[PDB]
Each structure stands twice: as C-alpha cells, then as structure tokens.
Amino acid sequence: TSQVRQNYHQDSEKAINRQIRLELYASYVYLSMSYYFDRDDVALKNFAKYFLHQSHEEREHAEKLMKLQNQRGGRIFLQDIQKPDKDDWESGLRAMEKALKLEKKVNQSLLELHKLATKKNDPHLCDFIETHYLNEQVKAIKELGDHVTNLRKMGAPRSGLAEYLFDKHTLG
Amino acid sequence: TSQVRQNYHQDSEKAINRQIRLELYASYVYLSMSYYFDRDDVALKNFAKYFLHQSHEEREHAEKLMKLQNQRGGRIFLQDIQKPDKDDWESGLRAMEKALKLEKKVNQSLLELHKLATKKNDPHLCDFIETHYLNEQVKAIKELGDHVTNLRKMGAPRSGLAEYLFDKHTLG
Amino acid sequence: TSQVRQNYHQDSEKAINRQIRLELYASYVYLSMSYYFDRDDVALKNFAKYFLHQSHEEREHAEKLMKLQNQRGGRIFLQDIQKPDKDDWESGLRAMEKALKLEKKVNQSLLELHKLATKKNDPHLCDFIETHYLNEQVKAIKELGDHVTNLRKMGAPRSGLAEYLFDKHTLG
Amino acid sequence: TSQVRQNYHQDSEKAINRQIRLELYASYVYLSMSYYFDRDDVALKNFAKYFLHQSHEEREHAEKLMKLQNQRGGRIFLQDIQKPDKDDWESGLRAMEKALKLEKKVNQSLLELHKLATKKNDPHLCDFIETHYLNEQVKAIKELGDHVTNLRKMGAPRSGLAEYLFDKHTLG
Amino acid sequence: TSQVRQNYHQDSEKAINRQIRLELYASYVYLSMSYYFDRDDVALKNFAKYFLHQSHEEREHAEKLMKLQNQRGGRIFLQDIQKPDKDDWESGLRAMEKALKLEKKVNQSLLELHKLATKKNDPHLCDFIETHYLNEQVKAIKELGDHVTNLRKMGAPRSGLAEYLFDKHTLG
Amino acid sequence: TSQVRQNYHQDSEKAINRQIRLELYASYVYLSMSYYFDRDDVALKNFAKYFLHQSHEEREHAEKLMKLQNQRGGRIFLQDIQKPDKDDWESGLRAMEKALKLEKKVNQSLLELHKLATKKNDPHLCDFIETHYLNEQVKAIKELGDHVTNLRKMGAPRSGLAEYLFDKHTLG
Ligand SMILES: [Cl-]
Ligand SMILES: [Fe+3]
Ligand SMILES: [Fe+3]
Ligand SMILES: [Fe+3]
Ligand SMILES: [Fe+3]
Ligand SMILES: [Fe+3]
Ligand SMILES: [Fe+3]
Ligand SMILES: [Mg+2]
Ligand SMILES: [Zn+2]
C-alpha cells in the first residue's frame, strides 16, 4: 500500500486500469481509420489528418489516466490491445459513423467510472473525470454527429463528390 | 577514356544515356499535356500548371543524369526525342491515367538500371539512383494515383463539374 | 492489385505489417517503463521522460511504415498488440538493460526485413529501411549501451544514489 | 474552329508549330554544349553555365509560342526533336561559333515567320514576334559575335589559356 | 564481445581499422603538399590552403570511421602512419596529379570495403559507406580531374604563369 | 638554400623537424585516448571531447611549426608517425596520468629546443618557442595535474562514480 494512497478504493484502481486499456484501444482504431484514408484508392487527406489527430488525443487521454493512477498511489497494469473490428472502413461517412459509436462507448465507460467514484465517495477522482474527460467527450460526440449529418445531407456515401468536398470544406 | 573513370562499366554508361533520353521524352509528354489544358476549349489552369511543373522536374532529372555521366567519366550521347503518343489528351482524368502509366514506365527503367548497377558492383551508382530517383518516383506515382482516385470518385470523366472542382480544390 | 503497386512483393507487404506491430509493441513497452519511473516509490522524472520520448519515437516509426505501405500500394493489416513482459521494471539499470535487449530485437527484425527486400530485388524498400531505420537503431543501441555502462560503473542498481545522480546529470 | 479564333491564318498556325519545334531543338543543342563543358577533360564551368542558361531560355521561347498558339485558337502539334549535330563541340570558340550560326538560323526562321504574318495581315502576330523574339535574337547574335571576337583576339583556339581566362573574366 | 555488437563481422571490423589508417595517411600526404606550396621558392598560397583543407577533411573522415567502429561495438587498433612518398611535390600540376591518384586509391579501398559489407550482409555498414564516403570520393576525383585539365590546357607545367593564374582564379 | 634564410642554423632546422614529428605523435595519442572514452563500455563523453580538443591543438602546434620552418627558409622533412603506446587507456585517471607524462615529455623537447636556439644565438626562434609553445605547455601541465588531483581525491580509479561526476562537473 502506497505511502500516498488515501481514499482510493481498489475498485476505482481497477476501473482506471480498464479505462486506460479502452483509451489505448480507441487510439488504435483511430490510427487504423487514419491510414485507411491515406490509401491510394481512398485518397482523402483531411479525413486522414482528422483521424490521426483523434488517435493522438486518445493516446494523450491514456497517458493522463496512467499519471492519475500513479498520483493516487494505484498501480498500473497494462493488458493486450485488441486490433480494431474492421480493416477497411468503406467510406468517409461509415468511418465517421463508426467513430461516433466508438466515442459513445468510451463515454459510457467514463460515465460508469464517474458513477463508481461517486459511490466510493471519491470527489478527487470525480472532479478529475469531469474536468479532463466528460466535456471533451461531449464535444467530440457533438462534432462527429455534425460531420455524419453533413455527409448524409450532401449525399454520402453514394456521392464520392460529397466526401471529397467535405474533406476540403470542413475537415481542411 | 577518362582520367576520373573508376568502377564504371560501359554497360552502365550506356544505360545512363538511355535513361537521359527517357527523362527527356517524359519531360516532353508533360509539356504536351500542360498546353492541352491551356486550350480555350479545355481551360483548366491548375491542370496546365501541374503538368508544366512535372515537365520541368523531368528535365531536371535528365540534367542531373548528364551531370552524373560526366562525374563518372562517362560520355553523353544524345538521341532524337520522340514526340508524345497523343496530341489530344481527352480529359483531366485520362491525362492523369496516362501520367501514372508513364511514371511507372520510367520507374521500371530506373529499377532495371539499379539492378544493372548492382550486377556491375557499382554502389555509388546504386545509391545515386536510390537517393535521387527511386523515392521521387514512388512519391510521384502515389500522388498520381491519389489524383486519379479522386477524379473517378467525383464523377469524372462524365462530370465536367468534377474536373473543374478538382482543378480548384486539389491542384490550386 | 493497387494501381500504384510496382515491384512490391506480397512477402514484403506482409513483413512490413509484422514490423508495424513490432514497433507498436515496442512503443507500449516504453510506455510502461515510463510510468513505472513515475511511481511515487521509484520517482525518477527523467527516466520517466526519457522512456516516454522513446514510446512516442516508436509510434512515429510505426506510423511511417504505415505510410510507406500505402505509398507502395500494400494494405495495412493490424494485429493485437501484446502487453509488455513486465509490470514492474525493478530499477533504472534493469529497465535500460531490457530496453537494449528490445532495441536489439527490433534491429534484428529490421535486418531480416532488409535481407528480404534485397532477395525480392526491392531497392526502394532497402533504401527506405537503411535511411529511416537502421542508422536510428544503431544510434539507439549505442546510447542504451552507454547508459547501461554508466549506471553499472556508478554502482547501480545497488546504489539508489547512483540512479538518482544519473537521472539528473545524464537524462536531465 | 476555336471560338477564340479570329484573323489567324492556317499557314500562320502551321508556321508557329514549326517555330516551336525549332526552339526546342535550339534548347537541346545548348544543353548538349553545356554538358560538353562540364566534362573532366574540358572543365570550363562558366561556359557550361552560359550554355545551360541559353538552353533554358530557348525552352521558355518555345513555351511562349505554345501559349500564343492557344491564345489565338490554334492547335499545337508537336514533332520529334532531332539530336544535335555534334556530340563533341571541340573548343570554347568553336562552340561559340556554332551557337552564333544557330542563332542566325533561328533568326532567319523568325523573319520568315514575320514576313508570313505580314502577308496574312496579322498585326498581332507581327507584334508578338517583334516584341518577344526579334530583339532578343539581335541581342544574342551581337553578344555571341562579341564573344567569338574576344576568344579569337585572345589566341583561341591555339590557346587553352585564352579560353580559361575568358571563362573567368567574361563568362564568370 | 561488446553488448552493442550486432551483425558486425570480424572482417568488417578489421577492414574499418585499415581504412582508418589509410585516411590518416591521406591526411598526412595533403599536409605535406600544403606546406610545400607555402615554401618561399614555390609560394602559391591558394594551393596551400586547398591542400590543407583536404588534409583536415581526411582527418574528419578518419574520426568518423573511428566513431562508426565504436557505434557498432568494434574496437579501434591504430597503426604507424607512414610518411608520404615525396618531400618535394615539384609543381602545382604534379601535386594535383598525385592527389587524384591518391584519391582513386582511397576510393578503390572504399569500394573493396563496401564489397566486403555486402558479402557479410551488413546493410548499415554499406549505407554508411555510401552516404558518407563514396559520393564525397566521386566528387573529389571529378574536381581534381577538372583542376589537372585546366592546368594542362593553361600550359602547366612549362608555364609558371599558368600555375599562378589558376592559384588566383580557380583556387582563390 | 633559401633566399629568406638568415641566422638559421642547420641544427635548428633539424630540431624543428623532430619537434613537428613529436607534436604529430602527441596529436595521435590524444586521438586514441578520445575514442577509447567513446567506447560503449567506457562511455565518458566529456573525457572523449577533452582529449579530442587536445588532439586538435597538438596538430595546430605541428602546423604552426611547419609554418615556422618555411618562414625561416628551413625545409620540412616528414617522418613516420608511431602508433601510441596503448590501445586501451584503462580509465579516466590513468589516461589523465599518461597525458600529463606526455605533455612533460613534449615540454622537455621544447626546452631542449629553446636551449639549442640560445646556443645558436637565434633570438627569433627563442621567442617563437617562448610565445607560442612554452606557456601553453605549462598551462596544459597544470590543468592535467589539477584533473589528476581531483580524480584521486574523488576516489578514482576505485569509484566509477568519481569518474562519472568529474566528467560532468569538470569536463562538461
Ligand atoms: Cl465547392
Ligand atoms: Fe478519450
Ligand atoms: Fe523522372
Ligand atoms: Fe523503431
Ligand atoms: Fe529563341
Ligand atoms: Fe577520405
Ligand atoms: Fe604541443
Ligand atoms: Mg543504400
Ligand atoms: Zn469550394
């Protein structure tokens, strides 16, 4: 038991370790999405940059939870990171729809984490989660929703023209 | 029979002269393509600029091979340069398709040149081809392929709208 | 078969995908190392920073390989990234010794990759591995080696004083 | 018939296509000459630079005629470019002498082309020729005459010292 | 066996020790030549500066090979450096001629060393040789060839004026 | 038999040639020492830099004596340069001890040279030795002696900690 550990429940500790794994997973998925758009047969540069940026942000959220684990005197245990569910993400619109689903999954996880911390009367952990994660997730979700909407409204994915113009006028 | 010549095989010297002619021919193809886009009945300014830039770069590659030839104590023998295959390149997509085929043809020659140099045990030449030619070719081919992909996905060569917006948003 | 693909063997494609996974695994080991030194009961900030920088460098090497795979017309196929071999890296010296061993494993894989590219007569791919990977590995292996020696000579991992002073004067 | 075409005779259009071929040929002659002076057994760097400059100028003159052909609604038809007359240009003076002869052949062609424009009452074309070509020709011919004179009175071609010194003081 | 050693053949290690000796010898030859031109009865200051520069470059090439030997886990064994072949280098042209011969002997040694690296499948070593040595050699040999040519056509060595003027206009 | 020669005795001329060889040898010793510190199993960067700097300075002293030789109308006669006494210099303390011995040896030679110059009534030479060599030697010897003293007092060569902290706080 760490010399710094105080009011930090073993269930919170384990759940932080589960959240680190999920973030690393989200990072990997966004990486895969990014380089799908860099394919010579997809060729959507700003989709590629957009996803690569989300991949780097998810990694940073992982690192920030590992930092938190050590700050509170928990112990980091890393697990296998599963490969993403697809190799070929099919289109700009389908990839955005999948990212929206993925972010809502990560949000559901973060909401269960905040609820756990609440039940364990861990206001530090609660505030950490609210300040650094919950509003970032709401914002990402809103932006992905907006992007899905525009693409659909523009005629994706049957219009490859819509995907191209979207890449240029929104993502660029 | 040059004072500077060393480990430079006569078959290498001749391959280099053939390459110089090929780079010059490619330069001429891109010249023709460029001024097809400058026609009043085609009128795609950024297609014209793009292909003119490629024309200038091919000529640079040719000059740099002439420079290599003398650096090694080879002798330059210049040949007739054949006119391009078409006078009318039909469309932006079809010009890009042709460029891509041409670049792969040039790359094929450069690969065959590297292999000769490797059989003749000429590492200076290998490296020169590697450093200046092979990565440039791979980048040119990927770029062309990306441009073809976008043009097809946008609805070319059906859509004259596709070619126009591509000219503006990708090539400008 | 991708329209940009040329002189790019299916074996090379497969090997580039294995190398991507190895680099991602290496990134994850250094990630683990970093946050081990951030523990309140280890508390060597510059060992932590040092390892976190190697984790980000490894990720960037994975990403540059993904880019090359697309550049050449191959297709990325990502796999599960296994967790690192340890949770607890014991000491500054033992993490360095493990890291030397990891880099030497990655270097072996890259040399096998180069030998394959050579056997497939892929000089573009040979030169990309030479230019972007092999000298970097040799630099990294040399530096890790230096660091292992210095810690040994100072009396690590026996001397916690030696790990602390090395953290300040070399890694700071 | 192009929608832009006005007061542009078919013979004029044909004559511009010939002049384009000749300017590209003149470019290639100067390119040959430039790299003759770059040889290790000739080694006059300022002669090389001077003829390479000429070569690039001549290409620019050709591209400007291509621009004109499109401006007026004519159609460009490119032809084979024949290799120059010599592989070996023999000395500084001899190359200057051959360039002067070349330049006066280009000029005669241009005066023939201006005569034709006058016969077809194409003032635009006459003025384009005047303003962009005839006075550049007259200047180039005088410059070349001046150079040939200086090399002669310096004792070229029986003086390699004469050619070296002119390389340095006039061409450098 | 060094803890850094990997894929580095004993013969390679031995060949690098020989190349180090030869580069130091080439340094000393150019040092001798430099101060020959500093004598009151020769007095060509730009030849002196030129050969002193060469001397320092050759020392740098030797130090870089020493750096390499350590990078790869090899061990440096230094040998006697034999005095150069002449005390008196006779004229500007003759010294340039001997330097060219020297440089082509260094180059042959380097190509022999690159052959060996290839036979031992050491791509790192091959690339180090290519990137730091073979193209510097090829450049130095061309430069020297150019100089010897100019001095010859200027009437050296039967013209002390020729050597003085080249000192000033080429080497100054 | 130089036009510039005046009050310059043949015994002075020969002593100067011997000194030049000694400065060159010393330069080589410091080279060897420097790259011993650059070994992965020694790994003392500021020791390596220090001894490389001394190597460069000895070579400068040698060049300056070559310059003196010609200034006086002497003739330079270069000799073989012997390899250093050791390949392995064992430790920072032991290398410093050896440097100190070497510097005293060189100083001995320079003192004997000054005394000859004084017997030959050559005040220009006396002063040259005094101004450029003797105070530099005395400073080098004092510095080396200070470095040895610190290293012994810190606990070298027992303590690998001593050598490390000295590298950082004195030589960095
Ligand atoms: Cl638009
Ligand atoms: Fe997240
Ligand atoms: Fe090219
Ligand atoms: Fe890596
Ligand atoms: Fe012209
Ligand atoms: Fe060298
Ligand atoms: Fe000295
Ligand atoms: Mg290479
Ligand atoms: Zn727009």
Report the C-alpha gap between C97 and F22 in whole angstroms.
Answer: 43
Q: Are the C-beta atoms of B58 and B23 separated by less than 8 Å?
A: yes
Strand partners, D106: none
Total H helices, total E strands in chain B? 6, 0
Full domain range(s) for residue F156:
1-172
Q: Are the C-beta atoms of E148 and E85 separated by less than 8 Å?
A: no
Q: Are the C-beta atoms of D90 and D33 separated by less than 8 Å?
A: no
Q: Are the C-beta atoms of C104 and C144 separated by less than 8 Å?
A: no
Residues of chain C with Cβ-Cβ distance to A81 below 8 Å are 28, 80-81, 83
Q: Which residues contact A121 (CB under 8 A, 6 or more apart)?
A: A7
Report the C-alpha gap between B103 and B100 in whole angstroms.
Answer: 5
Handedness of CA D19, D23, D24, D26 (dihedral sign): positive
Q: What are phi and psi of C29, to 5 degrees?
A: -55, -50
Strand partners, D169: none
Chain D residue with minimum CA distance to B4: D40
Report the C-alpha gap between A165 and F51 in whole angstroms.
Answer: 63
> How many A from CA of F21 to the centre of ligand 8?
40
Identify the CA nearest to B79 among candidates B56, B62, B96, B61.
Answer: B62
Report the C-alpha gap between D151 and D136 in whole angstroms.
Answer: 23
Q: Which residue has the tokens 């006086």?
A: F72
Cβ–Cβ gap F87/E67 under 8 Å: no
Chain B residue with minimum CA distance to C69: B142
Q: Are the C-beta atoms of E125 and E77 separated by less than 8 Å?
A: no
Strand partners, C81: A81
Report the C-alpha gap between C142 and C130 in whole angstroms.
Answer: 17
Measured distance between the N- and C-terminal CA atoms of chain F, rounded to whole angstroms: 50
Report the C-alpha gap between A104 and B54 in whole angstroms.
Answer: 47
Neighbours of C, requiring at least 3 CB pairs below 8 Å, are A, B, E, F
Q: Which two tokens stand for residue C128?
A: 């990309």
Report the C-alpha gap between C72 and A80 in whole angstroms.
Answer: 30
Does the annotation place B108 within a ligand binding site?
no
Q: Which two tokens stand for residue E25?
A: 């010898």
Give all strands (DSSP E) within chain F, no chain letters: none
Return the ligand number nearest the Cα of C26.
4
Q: Which residue has the tokens 């993403």?
A: A84
Identify the CA nearest to E155 among candidates E93, E96, E90, E88.
Answer: E93
Give residue numbers after which chain B breaks (C–N above 2.5 Å).
Answer: none
Number of domains in chain A: 1
Identify the CA nearest to F25 among candidates F82, F109, F97, F63.
Answer: F82
Identify the CA nearest to D30 among candidates D1, D8, D9, D57.
Answer: D57
Report the C-alpha gap between E147 and D43 in whole angstroms.
Answer: 8
Q: Which residue has the tokens 């900030």?
A: C45
The three-class DSSP label of residue F9 is coil
Identify the CA nearest to A101 among candidates A29, A20, A160.
Answer: A29
Concatenated DSSP letters for D36-83?
HTTSTTT--HHHHHHHHHHHHHHHHHHHHHHHHHHHTT-------B--
Q: Which residue has the tokens 């409204």?
A: A153
For chain C, state the CA radius of gyration. Answer: 18
CATH number for the domain harbouring residue B167: 1.20.1260.10
Question: What amino acid is encoded at C146 in this protein?
Answer: D
Residues of chain B with Cβ-Cβ distance to A166 below 8 Å are none
Q: Are the C-beta atoms of C85 and C40 separated by less than 8 Å?
A: no
Identify the CA nearest to C58 among candidates C108, C95, C20.
Answer: C20
Residues of chain F with Cβ-Cβ distance to E79 below 8 Å are 83
Does the annotation place D124 within a ligand binding site?
no
Q: Are the C-beta atoms of F167 and F151 separated by less than 8 Å?
A: no
Report the C-alpha gap between B150 and B10 in whole angstroms.
Answer: 44
Q: Are the C-beta atoms of D69 and D20 separated by less than 8 Å?
A: yes
Report the C-alpha gap between C48 and D74 in whole angstroms.
Answer: 70
Q: Which two tokens stand for residue D153?
A: 């009175």
The three-class DSSP label of residue A42 is coil
- Within a 10 A sphere around the Cβ of A154, how many other Cβ atoms? 18
What's the half-sphere exposure (Cβ side, CA atoms, 13 Å) at A116? 19
Length of chain F: 172
Give B130's DSSP letter: I
Cβ–Cβ gap B150/A43 under 8 Å: yes
- Directed axis angle between helix E10-36 and helix E92-119, to 10°? 170
For this entry, resolution in Å reads 1.9
Residues of chain B with Cβ-Cβ distance to D39 below 8 Å are 70, 75
Concatenated DSSP letters for E71-118?
HTT-------B---S-S---SHHHHHHHHHHHHHHHHHHHHHHHHHHH
Least CB–CB distance from A40: residue in C36, C63, C70:
C70
Q: Which residues contact E76 (CB under 8 A, 6 or more apart)?
A: E17, E20, E66, E69, E70, F32, F35, F36, F87
Length of chain E: 172
Strand partners, E81: F81
Neighbours of E, requiring at least 3 CB pairs below 8 Å, are B, C, D, F
Give F85's DSSP letter: S
Strand partners, C35: none
Q: Which residue stretches of C38-157 are H helix?
A: 45-71, 92-119, 123-129, 135-154
Chain C contact residues (CB < 8 Å to E): 100, 104, 107-108, 111, 114-115, 118, 126, 129-131, 134-135, 138-139, 141-142, 145, 148
Report the C-alpha gap between D33 and D84 in whole angstroms.
Answer: 9
Neighbours of B, requiring at least 3 CB pairs below 8 Å, are A, C, D, E
Cβ–Cβ gap D164/E146 under 8 Å: no
Residues of chain C with Cβ-Cβ distance to E2 below 8 Å are 145
Report the C-alpha gap between E86 and D56 in whole angstroms.
Answer: 48
Return the ligand number nearest the Cα of F99.
7
Least CB–CB distance from E124: residue in C100, C108, C134:
C134
Q: Which residue has the tokens 């756990």?
A: A116
Q: Are the C-beta atoms of C22 and C1 separated by less than 8 Å?
A: no
Report the C-alpha gap between E101 and E13 in whole angstroms.
Answer: 26
Residues of chain D with Cβ-Cβ distance to E146 below 8 Å are 40, 43
Least CB–CB distance from E111: residue in B70, B72, B123:
B123
The three-class DSSP label of residue F81 is strand
Concatenated DSSP letters for A82-141?
PPPS-S---SHHHHHHHHHHHHHHHHHHHHHHHHHHHHTT-HHHHHHHIIIIIHHHHHHH
CB-proximal residues (5 Å) to ion ligand 5 = D 23, 58, 61
Identify the CA nearest to A162 among candidates A61, A70, A38, A44.
Answer: A44
Q: Are the C-beta atoms of E75 and E8 separated by less than 8 Å?
A: no
Report the C-alpha gap between E142 and E140 in whole angstroms.
Answer: 5
Q: Which residue has the tokens 């469309």?
A: B91
In this complex, whether A and F touch, counting 3 or more CB pairs under 8 angstroms, is: no
> How many A from CA of B135 to the centre of ligand 3?
11
Q: Which residues contact A132 (CB under 8 A, 6 or more apart)?
A: A61, A64
